[PDB]
């Protein structure tokens, strides 16, 4: 439905077409001579003045062609940089799963799919986004039997009456056990430790 989404390729095409159009349009400039037609100058004067007339056209057209070549060089360099970035994205987000944040997609990356385009590529990125949050009360460690317990992976949370261990990115409470916790030291130096079993 929506149009005007493929702005970059259209912009590149328009820039190239406009450059070619202005280059071919520059052919109708007097450049200070008597006419823009070569044969008319040839078939109206004498060679001693004819060559003087022709020199101006020669230098003007040479200058215009030089300018066009320089602009093409600059645009080619920029396009090369863009192509290198696209190649890196294709290598890293299609052939594998990326951990560098926001490189390809907004969220936690899962996979990507490539598609062709007349002068480029289109990546479809699939990402995971958490939702439906909830408040909880937490504590960094648990003091029990004079010992300090820390979670292996996850975090301590509370319904409001009891305590559970959860994984960091999805709510799934479980009972605190010696299997998913480890002990180090005594509950005397940790700031914020709470009592439990």
């Amino acid at each position: 439905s929506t149009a005007s989404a493929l702005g970059k390729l259209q912009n590149v095409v328009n820039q190239n077409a406009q450059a070619l159009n202005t280059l071919v349009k520059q052919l109708s400039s007097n450049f200070g001579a008597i006419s823009s037609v070569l044969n008319d100058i040839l078939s109206r004067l004498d060679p001693p003045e004819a060559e003087v007339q022709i020199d101006r056209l020669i230098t003007g057209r040479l200058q215009s062609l030089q300018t066009y070549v320089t602009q093409q060089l600059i645009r080619a360099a920029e396009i090369r940089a863009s192509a290198n970035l696209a190649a890196t994205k294709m290598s890293e987000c299609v052939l594998g799963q990326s951990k560098r944040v926001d490189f390809c997609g907004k969220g936690y990356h899962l996979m990507s799919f490539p598609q062709s385009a007349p002068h480029g590529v289109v990546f479809l990125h699939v990402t995971y986004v958490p939702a439906q949050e909830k408040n909880f009360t937490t504590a960094p460690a648990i003091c029990h039997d004079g010992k300090a317990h820390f979670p292996r992976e996850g975090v301590f949370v509370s319904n409001g009456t009891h305590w559970f261990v959860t994984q960091r990115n999805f709510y799934e409470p479980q009972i605190i056990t010696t299997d998913n916790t480890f002990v180090s030291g005594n509950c005397d130096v940790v700031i914020g430790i709470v009592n439990n079993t």
Binding site: R80, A83, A86, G105, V129, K134
Partner: protein, 133 residues
């Protein structure tokens, strides 16, 4: 009267929305009549920070997004003598005394075309076989 200059044909308001047609100096205009206003950076919120409270997600969604990248452009070439003279012996003889003038241009254009081909082949050709579903 704005820091960007002077503006006629629009009304100044005191609200602030997203910027449609950027004018400058932090202000821009939109259509309702035409109104000129100051840009709004975004929504305002104050996340509830406490030293013993956390938030944990309970559900998830899967999103699919697009990204578009150009990788190539058209390959073009230009014949120097035909463009600059156009079938004239006198023009060619006069131009000959300028030395090597368009060989560099042809070299550059051929390099550009080769670079475009290399860009395409490097971007897409990244497999050894042709797998089939």
């Amino acid at each position: 009267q704005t820091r960007a200059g002077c503006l006629i044909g629009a009304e100044h308001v005191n609200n602030s929305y997203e910027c449609d047609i950027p004018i400058g100096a932090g202000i821009c205009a939109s259509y309702q009549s035409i109104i000129a206003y100051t840009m709004s950076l975004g929504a305002e919120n104050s996340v509830a920070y406490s030293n013993n409270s956390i938030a944990i997600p309970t559900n998830f969604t899967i999103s699919v997004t697009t990204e578009i990248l150009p990788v190539s452009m058209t390959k073009t070439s230009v014949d120097c003598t035909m463009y600059i003279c156009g079938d004239s012996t006198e023009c060619s003889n006069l131009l000959l005394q300028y030395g090597s003038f368009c060989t560099q241009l042809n070299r550059a254009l051929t390099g550009i075309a080769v670079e475009q081909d290399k860009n395409t082949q490097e971007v897409f050709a990244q497999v050894k076989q042709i797998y089939k579903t």
